[PDB]
mmCIF file of N, CA and C in Angstrom:
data_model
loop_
_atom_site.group_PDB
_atom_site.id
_atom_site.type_symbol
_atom_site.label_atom_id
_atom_site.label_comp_id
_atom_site.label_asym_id
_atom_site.label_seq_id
_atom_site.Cartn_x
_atom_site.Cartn_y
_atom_site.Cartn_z
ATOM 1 N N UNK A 1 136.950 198.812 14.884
ATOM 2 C CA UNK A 1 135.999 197.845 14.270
ATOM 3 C C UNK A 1 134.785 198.618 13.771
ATOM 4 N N UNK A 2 134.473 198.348 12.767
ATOM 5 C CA UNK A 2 133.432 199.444 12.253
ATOM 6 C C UNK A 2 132.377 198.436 11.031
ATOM 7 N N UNK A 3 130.977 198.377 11.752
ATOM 8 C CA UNK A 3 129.899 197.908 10.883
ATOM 9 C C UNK A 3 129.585 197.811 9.435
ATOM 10 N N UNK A 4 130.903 198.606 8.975
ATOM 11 C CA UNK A 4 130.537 198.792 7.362
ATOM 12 C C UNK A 4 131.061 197.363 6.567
ATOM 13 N N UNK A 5 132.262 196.508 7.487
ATOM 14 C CA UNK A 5 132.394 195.298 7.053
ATOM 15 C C UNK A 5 131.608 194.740 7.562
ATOM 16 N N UNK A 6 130.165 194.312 8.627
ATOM 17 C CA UNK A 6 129.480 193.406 8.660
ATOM 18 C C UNK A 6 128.151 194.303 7.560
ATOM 19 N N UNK A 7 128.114 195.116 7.345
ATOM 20 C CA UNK A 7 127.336 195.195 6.046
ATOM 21 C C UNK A 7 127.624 194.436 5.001
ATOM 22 N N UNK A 8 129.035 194.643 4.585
ATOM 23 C CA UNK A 8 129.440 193.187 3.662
ATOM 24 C C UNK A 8 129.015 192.061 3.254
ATOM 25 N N UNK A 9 128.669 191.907 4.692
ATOM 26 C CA UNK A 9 128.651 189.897 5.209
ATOM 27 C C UNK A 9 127.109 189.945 5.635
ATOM 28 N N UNK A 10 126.475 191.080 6.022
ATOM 29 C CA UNK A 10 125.151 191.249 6.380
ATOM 30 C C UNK A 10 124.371 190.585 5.079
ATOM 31 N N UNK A 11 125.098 191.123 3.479
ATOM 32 C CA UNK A 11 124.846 190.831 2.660
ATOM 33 C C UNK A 11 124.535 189.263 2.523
ATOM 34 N N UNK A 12 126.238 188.907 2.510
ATOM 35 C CA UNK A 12 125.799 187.396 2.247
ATOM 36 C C UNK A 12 125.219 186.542 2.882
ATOM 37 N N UNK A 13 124.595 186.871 4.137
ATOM 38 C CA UNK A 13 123.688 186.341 5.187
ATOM 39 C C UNK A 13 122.667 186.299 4.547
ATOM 40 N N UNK A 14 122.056 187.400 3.730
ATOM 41 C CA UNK A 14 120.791 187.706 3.548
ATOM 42 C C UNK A 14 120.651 186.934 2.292
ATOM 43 N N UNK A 15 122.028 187.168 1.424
ATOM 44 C CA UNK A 15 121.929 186.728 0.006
ATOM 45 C C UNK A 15 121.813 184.808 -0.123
ATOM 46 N N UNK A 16 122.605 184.375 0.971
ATOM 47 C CA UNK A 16 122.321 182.760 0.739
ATOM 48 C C UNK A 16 121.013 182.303 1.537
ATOM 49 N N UNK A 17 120.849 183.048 2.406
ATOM 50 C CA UNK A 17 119.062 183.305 2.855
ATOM 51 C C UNK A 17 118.179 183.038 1.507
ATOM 52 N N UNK A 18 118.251 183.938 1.201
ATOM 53 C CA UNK A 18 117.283 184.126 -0.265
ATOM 54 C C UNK A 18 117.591 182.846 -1.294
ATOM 55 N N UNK A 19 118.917 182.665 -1.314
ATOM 56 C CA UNK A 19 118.733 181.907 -2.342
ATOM 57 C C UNK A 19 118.603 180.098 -1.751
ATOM 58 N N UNK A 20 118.707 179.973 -0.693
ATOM 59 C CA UNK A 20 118.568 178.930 -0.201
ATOM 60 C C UNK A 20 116.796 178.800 0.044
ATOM 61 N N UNK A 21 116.475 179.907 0.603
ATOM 62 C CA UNK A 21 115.073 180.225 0.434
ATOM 63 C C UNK A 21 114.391 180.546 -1.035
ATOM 64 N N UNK A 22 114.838 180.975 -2.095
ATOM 65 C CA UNK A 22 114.264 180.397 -3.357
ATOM 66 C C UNK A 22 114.753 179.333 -3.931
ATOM 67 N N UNK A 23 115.464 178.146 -3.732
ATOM 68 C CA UNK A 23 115.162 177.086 -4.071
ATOM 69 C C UNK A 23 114.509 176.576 -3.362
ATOM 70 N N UNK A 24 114.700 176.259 -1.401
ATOM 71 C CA UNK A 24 113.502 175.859 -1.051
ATOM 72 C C UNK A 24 112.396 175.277 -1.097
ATOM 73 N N UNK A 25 112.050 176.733 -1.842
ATOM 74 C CA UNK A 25 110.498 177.462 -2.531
ATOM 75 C C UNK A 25 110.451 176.380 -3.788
ATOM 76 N N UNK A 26 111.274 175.857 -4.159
ATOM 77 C CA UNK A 26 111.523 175.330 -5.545
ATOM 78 C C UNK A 26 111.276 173.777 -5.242
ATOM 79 N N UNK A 27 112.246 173.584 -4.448
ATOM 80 C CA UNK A 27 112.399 172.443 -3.664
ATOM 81 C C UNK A 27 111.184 171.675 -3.378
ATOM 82 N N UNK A 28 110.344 172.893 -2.523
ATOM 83 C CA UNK A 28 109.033 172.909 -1.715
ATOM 84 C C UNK A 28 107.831 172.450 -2.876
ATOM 85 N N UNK A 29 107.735 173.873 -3.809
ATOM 86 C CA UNK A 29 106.664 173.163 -4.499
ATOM 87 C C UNK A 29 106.945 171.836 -5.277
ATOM 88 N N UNK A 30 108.104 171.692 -5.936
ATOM 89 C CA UNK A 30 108.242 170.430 -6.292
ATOM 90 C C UNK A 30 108.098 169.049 -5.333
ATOM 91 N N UNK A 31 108.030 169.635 -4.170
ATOM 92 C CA UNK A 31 107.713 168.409 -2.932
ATOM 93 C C UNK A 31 106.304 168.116 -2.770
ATOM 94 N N UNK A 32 105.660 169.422 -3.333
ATOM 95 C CA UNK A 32 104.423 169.265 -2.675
ATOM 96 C C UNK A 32 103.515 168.968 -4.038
ATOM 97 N N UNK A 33 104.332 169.269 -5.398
ATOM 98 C CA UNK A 33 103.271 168.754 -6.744
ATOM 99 C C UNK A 33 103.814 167.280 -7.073
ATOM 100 N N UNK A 34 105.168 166.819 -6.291
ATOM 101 C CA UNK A 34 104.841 165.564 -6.503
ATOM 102 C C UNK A 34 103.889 164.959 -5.019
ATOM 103 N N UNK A 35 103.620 165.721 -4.386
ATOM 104 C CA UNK A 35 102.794 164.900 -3.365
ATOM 105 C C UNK A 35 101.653 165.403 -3.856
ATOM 106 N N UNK A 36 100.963 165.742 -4.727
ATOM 107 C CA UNK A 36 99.851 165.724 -5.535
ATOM 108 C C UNK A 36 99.647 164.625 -6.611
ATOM 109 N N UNK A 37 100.982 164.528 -7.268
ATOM 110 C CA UNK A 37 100.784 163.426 -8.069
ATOM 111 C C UNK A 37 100.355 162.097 -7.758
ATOM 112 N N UNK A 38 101.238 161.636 -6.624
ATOM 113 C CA UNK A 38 100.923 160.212 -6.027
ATOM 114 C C UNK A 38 99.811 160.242 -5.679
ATOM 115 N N UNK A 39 99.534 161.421 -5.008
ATOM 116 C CA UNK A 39 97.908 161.226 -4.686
ATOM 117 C C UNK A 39 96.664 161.270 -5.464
ATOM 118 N N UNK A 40 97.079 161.663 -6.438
ATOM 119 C CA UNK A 40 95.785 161.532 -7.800
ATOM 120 C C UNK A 40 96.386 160.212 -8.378
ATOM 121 N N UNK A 41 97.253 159.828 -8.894
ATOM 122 C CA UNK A 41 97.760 158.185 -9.195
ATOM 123 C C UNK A 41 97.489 157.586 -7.924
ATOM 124 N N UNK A 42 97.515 157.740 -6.773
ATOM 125 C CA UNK A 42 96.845 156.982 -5.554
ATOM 126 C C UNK A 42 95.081 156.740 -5.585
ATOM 127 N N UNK A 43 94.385 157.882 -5.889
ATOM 128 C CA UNK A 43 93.483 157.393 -6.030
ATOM 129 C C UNK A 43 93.132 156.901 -7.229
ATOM 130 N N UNK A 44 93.647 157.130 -8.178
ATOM 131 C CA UNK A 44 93.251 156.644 -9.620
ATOM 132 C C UNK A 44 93.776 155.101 -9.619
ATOM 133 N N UNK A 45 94.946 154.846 -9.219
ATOM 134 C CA UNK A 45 95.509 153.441 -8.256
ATOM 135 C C UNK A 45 93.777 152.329 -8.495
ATOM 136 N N UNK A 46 93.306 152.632 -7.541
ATOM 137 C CA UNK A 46 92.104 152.150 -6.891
ATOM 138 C C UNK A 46 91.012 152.185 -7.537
ATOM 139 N N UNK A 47 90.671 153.651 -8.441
ATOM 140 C CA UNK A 47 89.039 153.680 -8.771
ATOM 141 C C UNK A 47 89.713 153.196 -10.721
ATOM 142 N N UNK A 48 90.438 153.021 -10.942
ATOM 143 C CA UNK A 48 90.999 152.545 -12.089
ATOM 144 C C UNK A 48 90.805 151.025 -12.630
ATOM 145 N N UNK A 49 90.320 150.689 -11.264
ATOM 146 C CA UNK A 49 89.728 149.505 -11.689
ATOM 147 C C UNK A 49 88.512 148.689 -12.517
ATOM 148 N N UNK A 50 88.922 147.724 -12.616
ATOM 149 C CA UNK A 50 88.153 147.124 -14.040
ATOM 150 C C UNK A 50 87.418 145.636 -14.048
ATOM 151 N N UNK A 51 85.918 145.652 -14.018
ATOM 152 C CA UNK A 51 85.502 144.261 -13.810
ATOM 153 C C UNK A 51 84.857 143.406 -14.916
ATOM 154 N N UNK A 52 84.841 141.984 -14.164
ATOM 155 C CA UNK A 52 84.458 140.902 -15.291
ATOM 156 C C UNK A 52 82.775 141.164 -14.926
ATOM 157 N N UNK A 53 81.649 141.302 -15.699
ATOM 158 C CA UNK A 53 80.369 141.522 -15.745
ATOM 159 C C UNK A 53 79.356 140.934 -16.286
ATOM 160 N N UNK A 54 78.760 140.047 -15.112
ATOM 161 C CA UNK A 54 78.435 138.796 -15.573
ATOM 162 C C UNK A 54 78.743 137.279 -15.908
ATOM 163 N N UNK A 55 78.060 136.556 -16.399
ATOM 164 C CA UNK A 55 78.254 134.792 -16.858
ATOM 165 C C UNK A 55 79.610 135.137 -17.621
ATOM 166 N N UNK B 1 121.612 184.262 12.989
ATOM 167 C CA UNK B 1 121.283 183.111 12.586
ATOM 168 C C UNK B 1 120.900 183.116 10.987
ATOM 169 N N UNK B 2 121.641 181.821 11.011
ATOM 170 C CA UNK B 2 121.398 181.669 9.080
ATOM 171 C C UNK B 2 120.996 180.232 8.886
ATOM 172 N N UNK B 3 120.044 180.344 7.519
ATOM 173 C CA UNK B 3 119.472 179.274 7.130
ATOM 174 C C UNK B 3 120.413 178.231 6.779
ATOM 175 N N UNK B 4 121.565 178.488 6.722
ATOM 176 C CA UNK B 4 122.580 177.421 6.148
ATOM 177 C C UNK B 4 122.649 176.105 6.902
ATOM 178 N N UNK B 5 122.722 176.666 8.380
ATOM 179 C CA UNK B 5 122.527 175.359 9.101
ATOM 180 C C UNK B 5 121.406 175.261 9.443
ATOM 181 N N UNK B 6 119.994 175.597 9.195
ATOM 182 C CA UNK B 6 118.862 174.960 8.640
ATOM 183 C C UNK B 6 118.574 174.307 7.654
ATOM 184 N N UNK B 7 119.160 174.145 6.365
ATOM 185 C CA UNK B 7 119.769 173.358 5.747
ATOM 186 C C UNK B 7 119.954 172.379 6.220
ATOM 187 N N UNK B 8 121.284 172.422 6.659
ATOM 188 C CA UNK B 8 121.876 170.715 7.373
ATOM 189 C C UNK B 8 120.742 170.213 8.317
ATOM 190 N N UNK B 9 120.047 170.556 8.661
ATOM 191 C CA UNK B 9 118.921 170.311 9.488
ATOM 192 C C UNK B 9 117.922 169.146 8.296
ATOM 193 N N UNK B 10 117.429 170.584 7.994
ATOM 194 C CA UNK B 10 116.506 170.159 6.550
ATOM 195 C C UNK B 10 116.936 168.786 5.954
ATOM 196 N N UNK B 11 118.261 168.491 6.023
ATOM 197 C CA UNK B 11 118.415 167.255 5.259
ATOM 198 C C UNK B 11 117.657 165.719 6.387
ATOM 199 N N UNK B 12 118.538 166.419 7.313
ATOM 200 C CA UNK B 12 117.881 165.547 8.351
ATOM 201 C C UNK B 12 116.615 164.980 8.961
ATOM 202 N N UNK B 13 115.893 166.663 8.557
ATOM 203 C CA UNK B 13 114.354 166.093 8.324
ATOM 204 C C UNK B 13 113.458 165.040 7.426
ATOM 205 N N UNK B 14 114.258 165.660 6.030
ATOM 206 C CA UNK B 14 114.001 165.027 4.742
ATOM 207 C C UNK B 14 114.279 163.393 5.124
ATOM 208 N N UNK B 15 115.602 163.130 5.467
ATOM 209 C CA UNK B 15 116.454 161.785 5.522
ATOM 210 C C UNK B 15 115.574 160.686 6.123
ATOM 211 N N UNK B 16 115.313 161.253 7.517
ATOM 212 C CA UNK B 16 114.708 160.629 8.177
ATOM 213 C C UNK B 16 113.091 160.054 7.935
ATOM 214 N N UNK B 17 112.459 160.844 7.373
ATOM 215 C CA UNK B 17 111.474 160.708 6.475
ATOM 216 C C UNK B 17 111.872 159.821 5.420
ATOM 217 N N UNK B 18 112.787 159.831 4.350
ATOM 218 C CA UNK B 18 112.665 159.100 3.485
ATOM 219 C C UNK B 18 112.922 157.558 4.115
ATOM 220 N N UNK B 19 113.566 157.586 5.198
ATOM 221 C CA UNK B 19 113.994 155.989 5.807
ATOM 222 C C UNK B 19 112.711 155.842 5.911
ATOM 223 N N UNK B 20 111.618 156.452 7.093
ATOM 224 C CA UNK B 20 110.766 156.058 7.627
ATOM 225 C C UNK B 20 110.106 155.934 6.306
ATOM 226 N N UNK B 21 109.799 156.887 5.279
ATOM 227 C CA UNK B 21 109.346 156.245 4.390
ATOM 228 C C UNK B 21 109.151 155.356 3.651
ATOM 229 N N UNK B 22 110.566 155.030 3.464
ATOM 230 C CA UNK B 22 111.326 153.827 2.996
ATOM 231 C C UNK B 22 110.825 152.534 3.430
ATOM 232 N N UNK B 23 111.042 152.187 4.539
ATOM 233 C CA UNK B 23 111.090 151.533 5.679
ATOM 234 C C UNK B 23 108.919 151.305 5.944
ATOM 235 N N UNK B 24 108.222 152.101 6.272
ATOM 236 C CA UNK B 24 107.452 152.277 6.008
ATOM 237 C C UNK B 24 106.452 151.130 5.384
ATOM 238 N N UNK B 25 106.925 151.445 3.879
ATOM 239 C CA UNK B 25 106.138 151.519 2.553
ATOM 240 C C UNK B 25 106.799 149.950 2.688
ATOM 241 N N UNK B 26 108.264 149.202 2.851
ATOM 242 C CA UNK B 26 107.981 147.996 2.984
ATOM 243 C C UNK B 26 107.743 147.187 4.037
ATOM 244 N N UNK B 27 107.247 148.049 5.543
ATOM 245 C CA UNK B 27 106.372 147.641 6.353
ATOM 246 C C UNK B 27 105.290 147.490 5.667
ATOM 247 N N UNK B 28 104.863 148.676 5.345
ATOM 248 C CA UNK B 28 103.348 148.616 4.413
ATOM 249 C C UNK B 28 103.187 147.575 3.681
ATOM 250 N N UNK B 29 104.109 147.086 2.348
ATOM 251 C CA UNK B 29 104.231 146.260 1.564
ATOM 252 C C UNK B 29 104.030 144.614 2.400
ATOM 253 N N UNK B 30 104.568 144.337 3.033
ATOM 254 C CA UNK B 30 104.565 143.257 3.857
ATOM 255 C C UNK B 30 103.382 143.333 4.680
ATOM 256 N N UNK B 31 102.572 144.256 5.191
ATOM 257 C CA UNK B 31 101.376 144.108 5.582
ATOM 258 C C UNK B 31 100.578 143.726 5.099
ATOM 259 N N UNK B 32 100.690 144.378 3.720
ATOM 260 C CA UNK B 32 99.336 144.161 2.639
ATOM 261 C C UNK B 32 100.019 142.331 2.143
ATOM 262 N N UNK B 33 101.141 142.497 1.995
ATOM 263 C CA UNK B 33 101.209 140.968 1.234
ATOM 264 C C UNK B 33 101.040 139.877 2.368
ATOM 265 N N UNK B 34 101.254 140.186 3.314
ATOM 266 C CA UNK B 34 100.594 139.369 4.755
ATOM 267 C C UNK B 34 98.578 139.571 4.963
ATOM 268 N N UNK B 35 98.672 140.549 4.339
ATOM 269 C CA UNK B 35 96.971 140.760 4.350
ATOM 270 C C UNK B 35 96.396 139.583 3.437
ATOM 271 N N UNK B 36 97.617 139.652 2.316
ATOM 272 C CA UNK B 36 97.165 139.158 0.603
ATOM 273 C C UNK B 36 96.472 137.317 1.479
ATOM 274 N N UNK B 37 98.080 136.912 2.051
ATOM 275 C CA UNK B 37 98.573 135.669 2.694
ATOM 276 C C UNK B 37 96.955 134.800 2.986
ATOM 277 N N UNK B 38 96.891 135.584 4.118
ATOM 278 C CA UNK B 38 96.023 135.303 5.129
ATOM 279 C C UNK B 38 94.490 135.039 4.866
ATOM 280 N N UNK B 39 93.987 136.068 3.798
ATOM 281 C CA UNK B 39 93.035 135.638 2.536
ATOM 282 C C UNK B 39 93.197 135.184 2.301
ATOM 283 N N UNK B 40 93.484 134.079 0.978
ATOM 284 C CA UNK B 40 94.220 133.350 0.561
ATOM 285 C C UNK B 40 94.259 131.665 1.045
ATOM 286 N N UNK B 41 94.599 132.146 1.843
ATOM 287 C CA UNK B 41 94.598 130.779 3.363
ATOM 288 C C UNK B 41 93.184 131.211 3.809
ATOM 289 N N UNK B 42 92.826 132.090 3.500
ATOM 290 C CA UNK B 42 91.519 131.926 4.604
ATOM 291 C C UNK B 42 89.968 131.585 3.779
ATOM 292 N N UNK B 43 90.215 132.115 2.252
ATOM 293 C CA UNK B 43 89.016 130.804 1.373
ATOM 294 C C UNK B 43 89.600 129.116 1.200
ATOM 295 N N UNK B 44 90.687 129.520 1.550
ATOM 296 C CA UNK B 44 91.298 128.423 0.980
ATOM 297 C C UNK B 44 91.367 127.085 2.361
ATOM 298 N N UNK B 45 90.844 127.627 3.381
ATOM 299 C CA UNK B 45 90.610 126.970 4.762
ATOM 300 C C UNK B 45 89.493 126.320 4.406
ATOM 301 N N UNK B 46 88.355 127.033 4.010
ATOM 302 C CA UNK B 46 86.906 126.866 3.633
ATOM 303 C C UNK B 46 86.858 126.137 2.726
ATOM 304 N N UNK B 47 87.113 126.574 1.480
ATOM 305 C CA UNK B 47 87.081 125.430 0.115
ATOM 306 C C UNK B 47 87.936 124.350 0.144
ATOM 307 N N UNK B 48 88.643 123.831 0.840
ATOM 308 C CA UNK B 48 89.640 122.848 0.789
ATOM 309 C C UNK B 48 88.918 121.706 1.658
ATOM 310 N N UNK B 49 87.092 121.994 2.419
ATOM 311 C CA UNK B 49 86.784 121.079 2.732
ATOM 312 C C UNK B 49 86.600 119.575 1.811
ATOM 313 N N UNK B 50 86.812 118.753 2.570
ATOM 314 C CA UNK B 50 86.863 117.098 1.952
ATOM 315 C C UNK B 50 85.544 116.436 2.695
ATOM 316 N N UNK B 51 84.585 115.703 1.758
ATOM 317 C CA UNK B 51 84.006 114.950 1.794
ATOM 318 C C UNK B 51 84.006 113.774 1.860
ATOM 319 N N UNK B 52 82.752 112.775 2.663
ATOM 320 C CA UNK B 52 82.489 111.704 2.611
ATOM 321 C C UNK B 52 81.123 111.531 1.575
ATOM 322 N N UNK B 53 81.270 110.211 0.497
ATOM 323 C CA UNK B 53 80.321 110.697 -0.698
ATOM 324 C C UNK B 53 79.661 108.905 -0.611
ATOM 325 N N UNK B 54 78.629 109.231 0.003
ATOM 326 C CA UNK B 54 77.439 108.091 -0.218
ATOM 327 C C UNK B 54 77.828 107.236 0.702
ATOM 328 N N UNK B 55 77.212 105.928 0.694
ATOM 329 C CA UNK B 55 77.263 104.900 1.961
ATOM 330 C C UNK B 55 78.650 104.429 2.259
#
């Protein structure tokens, strides 16, 4: 038994690592710029408002 | 150890979140429209007084 076949596979450990970890990353910021969005349409939600002024 | 079955995890995190989210937001929804309710009924307790008018 000799390590040069888990170098192989060491590979694809590392390689679906990475790429599971750069989408993630992809995943992630897209999780986190739409949790920016709602939250600026959340507050804009609210201060977006509009009044009757006066008689 | 590999992220792959962090992954299957990950979904689970996500999942559960989106129920509670889910779930949540029409707790939430039903709060606020039970908030709406209860206002509502509650000028409407006040202004719905009835008078006696002159002798």
């Amino acid at each position: 038994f000799s390590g040069l076949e888990a170098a192989i596979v060491l590979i694809a450990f590392v390689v679906v690592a990475a790429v599971f970890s750069y989408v993630m990353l992809g995943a992630g910021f897209f999780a986190t710029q739409k949790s920016q969005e709602v939250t600026y349409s959340g507050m804009k939600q609210a201060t977006s408002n509009l009044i009757l002024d006066g008689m």
